[PDB]
Amino acid sequence: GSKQFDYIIIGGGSAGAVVANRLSEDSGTSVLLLEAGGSDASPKFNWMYDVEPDPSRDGRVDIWPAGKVLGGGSMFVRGNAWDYDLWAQKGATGWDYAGVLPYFRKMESYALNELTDLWVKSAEKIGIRRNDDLNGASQEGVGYCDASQKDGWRHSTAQAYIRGIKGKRANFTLELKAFVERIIIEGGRAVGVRYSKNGRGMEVRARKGVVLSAGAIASPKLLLLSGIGPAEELAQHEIPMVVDSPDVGANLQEHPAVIMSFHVNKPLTTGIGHAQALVKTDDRYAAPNVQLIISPFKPSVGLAVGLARPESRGTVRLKSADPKDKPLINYPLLGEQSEVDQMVAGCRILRKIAHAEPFRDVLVDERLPGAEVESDAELERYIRQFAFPMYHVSCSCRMGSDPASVVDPELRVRGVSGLWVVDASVMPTLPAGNINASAIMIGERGADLIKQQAKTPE
């Protein structure tokens, strides 16, 4: 621990790069950023986290990619106010829509066709209202993704936050290929970090504290390895318990989606195309529950049915006490029958749209699901077999006001001083969209919160 910094930030992804940039704005604040990856898929720049067999999909085992690269890789932020107001309703005081909107604006400050038209026209004919200003800060209805909306902003990538400081700020230091193994906690306070680099074990110290920005998979894992988590989990791996925190690694959420495809005469994995439709499958829903997307590039058109807000929940646990082991991840992509019902209902809407004029006037044949797949049970079969995750993993280190939450609304880990979690893991619920922008926004507001806490004693 010969080296001492004011703050140590674990993880240089979307949120962590923002925190590093913003906290080092103060000349007298030294900042160290530790990133397991390098600068500038494959194991070199992808974690390739294995997921346990999924009973909702006959034990199917998926591989979740996650950025292992400074900043990231693989824009516009149409804030859905229902999602952030839901956060505040679940205890994230100050993180309501009115609370995050200034930080989406700060992000904007920092940043300094015929087939799609045909699809949107067909949606309107079937009765899907066109999205416009009267909707407010919802994207309910059908609209074009590549457009500027009154409820949307512009933002930058995390690589823009790092480019402005790397080798330019004396109070900022960066260690790549640094695999953080444990947070060091002494006297109820996070005082440093142990990591390995180049085959050697290192330790470094923090004067003011540690910021855990490792993302929704690695952050809960790091908390567990540091003794912060459910007592049952910690004892099993004989990790001394520092904080009994019941929800570390709980509340894991991901977006499921499935592709429909049609040939015509005249990717979608992450869920952005030329046009989208946030629609309600029933009127019993308070917010649009299904997202329909079209990204039209023998020749075919690609459509997607995504579930805006998952009902299933997963877990992140340890495989062992060995820090280099990957986490144990459980997530039933379709664990609730209603999730399938909504996605089947989504598939039927996409059919109505394609069969309605004028898009029907360019239709040829349904290609991927199959025209013969018509019964609810036949569509459920197709969904269970071809559904996929959109890589929007979040919510594993829930912020809230209840004493069971992992962090309070100021992002402090309950039970420990000088320790924050600032990344997508703190989300109480997965928003319907703009995940990466939401994570950047969390870094923006989290940096302000940490700066505020530094003005006053803990």
Least distance to ligand FAD from the beta carbon of 411, Å? 13
> Interior CA angle at 416 toward 411 and 422, to 5°?
25
> Which x/- pattern, by CB under 6 A, does the window 262-281 give for ligand FAD?
--------x-x---------
Task: Enumerate the active-site residues.
Answer: 392
For 82-103, b/e burial (b = at least 16 CB within 10 A) is bbbbbbbebbbeebbbebbbeb
Q: Does 257 engage in binding with ligand FAD (CB under 6 A)?
A: no
Residue 249 engages ligand FAD in binding (rule: CB under 6 A): no
Query: Which of residues 74, 236, 385, 401 is near ligand FAD by CB under 6 A?
Result: 74
When binding is defined by CB under 6 A, the residue of 65, 99, 370, 415 that contacts ligand FAD is: 65
Q: Residue 10, interface with ligand FAD (CB under 6 A)?
A: yes
Nearest to residue 350, comparing CAs of 265, 455, 275?
Answer: 275
Question: Helix, strand, coil: what percent of the chain each, to 5?
Answer: 30, 25, 45
Contact yes or no for 160/20 (Cβ under 8 A):
no
Which of 36, 118, 292, 334 contacts ligand FAD by CB under 6 A?
Answer: 36
State yes or no: residue 439 binds ligand FAD (CB under 6 A). yes
Residues making up the chain, counted from first to last: 458
392 binds ligand FAD (CB under 6 A): yes
Per-residue x/- marks for ligand FAD, 413-432, CB under 6 A?
A: ----------xx--------
**Cα 60-65-67 angle, rounded to 5 deg:** 165
What is the closest distance, in whole angstroms, from the C-beta atom of residue 401 to ligand FAD in the complex? 22
Residue from 7, 8, 9, 12 binding ligand FAD (CB under 6 A): 12
SS3 state of residue 267: coil
**Can residue 225 be called a binding residue for ligand FAD (CB under 6 A)?**
no
- If one asks whether residue 385 binds ligand FAD (CB under 6 A), the answer comes out as no
Stretch that binds ligand FAD, among 29-37, 284-292, 308-316, 333-341 (CB under 6 A): 29-37
Which residue minimizes CB distance to ligand FAD?
13
Q: Of the two residues 74 and 375, which places its CB atom closer to ligand FAD in the complex?
A: 74
Query: For 90-225, where are the alpha helices, taking DSSP H only?
Result: 97-110, 114-126, 158-163, 215-225
Closest CA to 425 of 402, 400, 388: 400
Report the nearest approach of ligand FAD to the CB of residue 362 (Å): 27
Binding test (CB under 6 A) with ligand FAD, winner from 8, 32, 165, 180: 180
Spatial contact of 23 and 15, defined as CB atoms under 8 Å apart:
no
**If you search the block for the tokens 């069969």, which residue do you land on?**
355
Q: Please report how the helices 97-110 and 81-89 are oriented relative to each other, as an axis angle in degrees rounded to 10.
A: 130
209 binds ligand FAD (CB under 6 A): no
Instruction: Classify strands 256-264 and 243-244 as parallel, antiparallel or unpaired.
Output: unpaired
Give how many residues touch ligand FAD by CB under 6 A: 36
Q: Looking at residues 118 to 177 of the shown chain, list those that interact with ligand FAD (rule: CB under 6 A).
A: none
Sequence-ordered alpha helix ranges (H) in 399-457: 435-454
Name the residues that contact ligand FAD, by CB under 6 A: 10-16, 34-37, 65-68, 72, 74, 178-180, 213-216, 218, 222, 270, 272, 391-392, 423-424, 434-436, 439
